[PDB]
């Protein structure tokens, strides 16, 4: 079960979600065909 692992990090997941929503960051990498050089 991965549920215990998710419960361990739940405060962090909540804070990360709040921070990402505030910063307006799109989850994932919807520019997959991108390389730095």
């Amino acid at each position: 079960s991965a549920s215990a692992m998710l419960s361990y990090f739940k405060p962090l997941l909540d804070w990360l979600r709040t921070e990402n929503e505030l910063h307006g960051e799109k989850l994932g990498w919807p520019q997959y065909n991108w390389t730095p050089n």
Partner: protein
């Protein structure tokens, strides 16, 4: 407990079946193995389990009572009625005499049941399962006579019309019986019989079943047979039988009351049955007057004798079996722990019957019979059935009748009735052995008259068994039929063959007309795109969906596994799934709406120039891709089209995937990729395709390297490097499926001899009608039949007459009526136009070749078989020789340079298309089963594009661009692996036909023309259509079953 027992279904336990009203009807009329077995097991459990302890207690009590009476047993008391010290030995000898007839009958009936039920529930060297026969106790086999009638063409004897023709009613039957009796010096019948008895009760109470009853009020003037007389042949026979009982009563009613009831239990039934059988003879019936004309044949005689055999010979083992078990139980030789063991030993030994389910000592299968609980001896019926034929033979010998015994009669044979009266008047005064010796001259019971009566049927049965090579008896006495799959819950499934044939006939009849109307409506909408035509097409689509739902739901009640056939089994299997019609009404409406929306937003999409001009795909965007050699123009067209079409389709695609997956799951498949791969009926299709592609890889790699070198020569080094992929737009298609078919950049060596197929068509007067005619002429010359003449003047192949010409690309159309083979494609005039024309004529000829097939099989052996058959001839035509024969000039193989040039041109097509075809369809399979998620649709598409093909996106792509949605087949939701398979096997077909053409040489330039043998070989395998699995037709065409 016996009366009140009932069997109830696993669900809906509200009301449930009883024995006499319900269980008898199902166990006599039904032919479903699961239903018959459910009824048999349910009744036997229900009536037997709660009857064992009572029977043990009753056995002990009865034995003790009769031991106090003097007999050692209850069975000893029962046997004491016949007063024969060796009764059991006599019965065993009788059965050993009757064994050959029963063995022949048993083998014949087992063969018929094996034909009907298949060699899994019934084997030909072994017992017959108990439920499969007519009765619940396998007692009599009349209800099985439907499948066992010998030469059923001759109608069975009956005078069912003649009683309505002339007034007979009920009173006259007893009058003719009485006068027949008086025609034998038998004593007349007293007047108290006439009005004091009962014949029909209008309103005086609710009568008893009144099947048979003769009454013997012990006052010497009272005699009644309450019968509820009807007007039927068997009713007349039973009238004679009951009147024979009454005549017995009256003639022997002189001795004291103790010396009554006949010589032994079994004389009464025998005495009645002698007259009952002698009255049903056609000669006596004609002499009475109920049979106007006397036709004659041995076939009706065999039919009658076999019905009699099924009635009586099938019972005789059972009658002896029932009392043998009861004697064993009473004597103590069977403790209350070998009840079922000894019962089933006897059942297998004497009757040759096998239990359908595994039994053991908790069961009491003997208690299911009526006579075991309601304690009544049973050997009287065995004895009576033997004595009846003994008496009949003796009477006919005295009557002077010479000939077959079953046709004898004693009417107007008063001389033969004297000894009948002499035996009859004895009553119970003398032992029955002496009475029998008086009547026949024999002391004990014999089976010789019984075997003499059944001589014709037994001779016919022996001949039929010897011809069929059957083994008499049942070796493999241990064999037991296997339990049906999902037996407790799959009982209400129709597995009858006649019902399946009726369903397939009705489905063909209604589907033919509805699909013909759909074909007309599709043609009209195709050539006349408008509002009214679109509305009528939509209403016909709704009608066809409703019809398909109805008939598929009807066919889902059948059990395709238990049907014993190939054609109807295939039809029911095919129609059992619902083409998206399994979805609920709301879901089906949403699915149709989303499919229409995707098709629409792909069809009307256009990419607009910055200056304002807008370009559609089919007219000019394809052309600006094929004809332009500028990197920026090609990139603009490619990117614009992919962007517009894909971003339009991406909004709808995930919902469509979910809905199609749901429908294909409701149809019994898995995730709608299995549904699409199941058209090929190969469980290992994916591995075969991968192996074929791996075989094809080196040639494609060499061609890709050469084309990349040429494109680097033209476009320079900035746009193409010699190590790495080529951009997807520098090839000649919007999808690079048939790349560099525009091959002026990659031509191997531009020699002076070079035909111009595109220019030759314009230079010559090759109208579309005349080139289509030339294709038809070549097709006919190959050895295949021509198209009906109205095809030319009925189909359209030039131009439209509406605002939109056609959809981007479509195929040929068949109307399923055996008369219309329309064609639709029109693309001005070109070489590609010629090859597409030949492909579509191949399609039409495939459509027409299986016109004689049923509609459900009117589909083609494989989805790729259609294209392969259409395109093998097109491949043959494109050769330099056959193009030379038809308005062109080509040196063919004389100049190896021109041959290599032609091979390269033919390779830039049909290669680089194989990777693309497998690529797009493989991507779709991985999307349908959840391997590819909505997040990385484009990522996985371009990974497959780089892996199988060698292409890279000319411009960076992102998630949110739905590049796979730019193909037509992705939003239209049509499978694509058919094109890969067809391109693989069309060369197999070309090789096979060239081999049959009589020469091989350079296969790449061999052509089929006036090769009637190859055309016949193709026709003999194209005509099976879908009636047989694909490998059979592939082997017929080629010999090698697989790709």
């Amino acid at each position: 407990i016996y009366s009140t027992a009932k069997v109830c279904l696993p669900n809906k336990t509200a009301t449930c079946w009883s024995l006499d009203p319900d269980l008898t009807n199902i166990l006599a009329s039904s032919r479903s193995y699961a239903m018959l077995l459910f009824a048999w097991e349910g009744w036997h459990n229900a009536a037997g389990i709660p009857l064992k302890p009572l029977y043990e207690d009753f056995t002990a009590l009865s034995n003790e009572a009769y031991k106090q009476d003097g007999f050692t047993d209850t069975g000893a008391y029962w046997r004491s009625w016949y007063n024969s010290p060796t009764f059991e030995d006599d019965l065993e000898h009788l059965y050993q005499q009757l064994e050959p007839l029963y063995l022949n009958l048993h083998a014949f009936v087992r063969r018929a049941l094996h034909r009907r039920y298949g060699d899994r529930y019934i084997n030909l060297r072994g017992p017959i399962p108990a439920h499969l026969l007519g009765d619940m106790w396998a007692q009599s086999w009349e209800n099985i006579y439907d499948m066992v009638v010998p030469f059923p063409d001759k109608p069975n004897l009956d005078v069912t019309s003649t009683m309505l023709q002339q007034g007979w009613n009920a009173t006259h039957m007893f009058r003719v019986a009485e006068e027949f009796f008086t025609s034998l010096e038998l004593s007349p019948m007293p007047p108290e019989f006439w009005e004091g008895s009962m014949l029909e009760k209008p309103a005086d109470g609710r009568e008893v079943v009144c099947h048979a009853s003769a009454w013997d009020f012990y006052n010497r003037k009272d005699f009644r047979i309450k019968q509820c007389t009807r007007v039927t042949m068997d009713q007349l026979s039973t009238v004679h039988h009951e009147m024979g009982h009454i005549q017995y009563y009256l003639q022997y009613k002189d001795l004291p009351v103790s010396l009554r009831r006949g010589a032994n239990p079994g004389f009464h039934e025998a005495i009645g049955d002698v007259l009952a059988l002698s009255v049903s003879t056609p000669e006596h019936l004609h002499k009475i007057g109920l049979l106007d004309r006397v036709t004659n044949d041995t076939e009706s005689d065999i039919n009658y004798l076999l019905k009699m055999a099924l009635e009586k010979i099938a019972f005789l083992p059972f009658g002896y079996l029932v009392d043998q078990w009861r004697w064993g139980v009473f004597s103590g030789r069977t403790p209350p722990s070998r009840y079922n063991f000894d019962w089933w030993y006897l059942r297998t030994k004497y009757q040759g019957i096998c239990p359908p389910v595994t039994r053991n000592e908790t069961h009491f299968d003997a208690g299911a019979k009526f006579h075991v609980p309601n304690v009544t001896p049973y050997i009287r019926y065995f004895v009576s059935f033997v004595l009846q034929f003994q008496f009949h033979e003796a009477l006919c010998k005295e009557a002077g009748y010479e000939g077959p015994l079953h046709q004898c009669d004693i009417y107007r044979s008063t001389k033969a009735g004297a000894k009948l009266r002499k035996v009859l008047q004895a009553g119970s005064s003398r032992p029955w052995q002496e009475v029998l010796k008086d009547m026949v001259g024999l002391d004990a019971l014999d089976a010789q008259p019984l075997l003499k009566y059944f001589q014709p049927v037994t001779q016919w049965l022996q001949e039929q068994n010897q011809q069929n090579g059957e083994v008499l008896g049942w070796p493999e006495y241990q064999w037991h039929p296997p339990l049906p799959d999902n037996y407790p819950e799959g009982i209400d499934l129709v597995t009858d063959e006649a019902e399946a044939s009726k369903f397939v006939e009705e489905y063909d009849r209604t589907s033919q007309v509805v699909w013909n109307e759909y074909a007309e409506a599709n043609w009209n909408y195709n050539t006349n795109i408008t509002t009214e035509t679109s509305k009528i097409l939509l209403q016909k689509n709704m009608q066809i969906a409703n019809h398909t739902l109805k008939y598929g739901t009807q066919a889902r009640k059948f059990d395709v596994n238990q049907l014993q056939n190939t054609t109807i089994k295939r039809i029911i299997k095919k129609v059992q799934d619902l083409e998206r019609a399994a979805l609920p009404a709301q879901e089906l409406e949403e699915y149709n709406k989303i499919l229409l929306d995707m098709e629409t937003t792909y069809s009307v999409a256009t990419v607009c120039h910055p200056n304002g001009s807008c370009l559609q795909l089919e007219p000019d965007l394809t052309n600006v891709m094929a004809t332009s050699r500028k990197y920026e123009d090609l990139l603009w067209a490619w990117e614009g089209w992919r962007d517009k079409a894909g971003r339009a389709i991406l909004q709808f695609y995930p919902k469509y995937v979910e809905l199609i997956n749901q429908a294909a799951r409701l149809n019994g498949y898995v995730d709608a990729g299995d549904s699409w791969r199941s058209m090929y009926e190969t469980p290992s299709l994916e591995q075969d395709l991968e192996r074929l592609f791996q075989e094809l890889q080196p040639l494609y790699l060499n061609l890709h390297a050469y084309v990349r070198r040429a494109l680097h020569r033209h476009y320079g080094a900035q746009h193409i490097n010699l190590e790495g992929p080529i951009p997807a737009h520098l090839l000649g298609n919007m999808w690079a499926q048939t790349w560099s078919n525009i091959y002026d950049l990659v031509v191997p060596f531009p020699s002076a001899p070079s035909m111009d197929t595109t220019e030759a068509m314009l230079k010559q007067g090759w109208t579309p009608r005349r080139m289509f005619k030339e294709a038809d002429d070549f097709f006919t010359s190959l050895g295949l039949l021509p198209v009906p003449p109205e095809f030319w003047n009925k189909s359209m192949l030039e131009k439209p007459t509406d605002g939109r010409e056609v959809v981007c690309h479509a195929s040929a159309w068949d109307f399923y009526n055996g008369k219309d083979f329309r064609i639709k494609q029109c693309t001005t005039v070109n070489l590609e136009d010629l090859v597409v024309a030949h492909h579509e004529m191949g399609h039409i000829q495939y459509f027409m070749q299986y016109k004689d097939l049923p509609v459900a099989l009117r589909e083609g052996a494989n989805p790729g078989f259609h294209e392969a058959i259409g395109d093998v001839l097109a491949l043959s035509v494109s050769t330099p020789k056959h193009l030379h024969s038809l308005n062109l000039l080509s040196s063919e193989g004389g100049s190896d340079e021109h041959d290599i040039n032609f091979l390269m041109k033919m390779a830039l097509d049909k290669i680089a298309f194989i990777p693309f075809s497998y690529l797009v369809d493989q991507w779709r399979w991985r999307v349908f089963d959840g391997s590819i998620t909505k997040e990385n649709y484009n990522q996985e598409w371009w990974s497959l594009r780089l892996k199988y093909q060698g292409l890279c996106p000319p411009v960076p792509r992102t998630q949110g661009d739905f590049d796979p949605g730019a193909k037509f087949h992705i939003p239209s939701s049509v499978p694509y692996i058919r094109y890969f398979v067809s391109f693989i096997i069309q060369f197999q077909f070309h090789e096979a036909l060239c081999q049959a053409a009589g020469h091989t040489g350079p296969l790449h330039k061999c052509d089929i023309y006036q090769s009637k043998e190859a055309g016949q070989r193709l026709a003999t395998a194209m005509k099976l259509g879908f009636s047989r699995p694909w490998p059979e037709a592939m082997q017929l065409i080629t010999g090698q079953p697989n790709m």
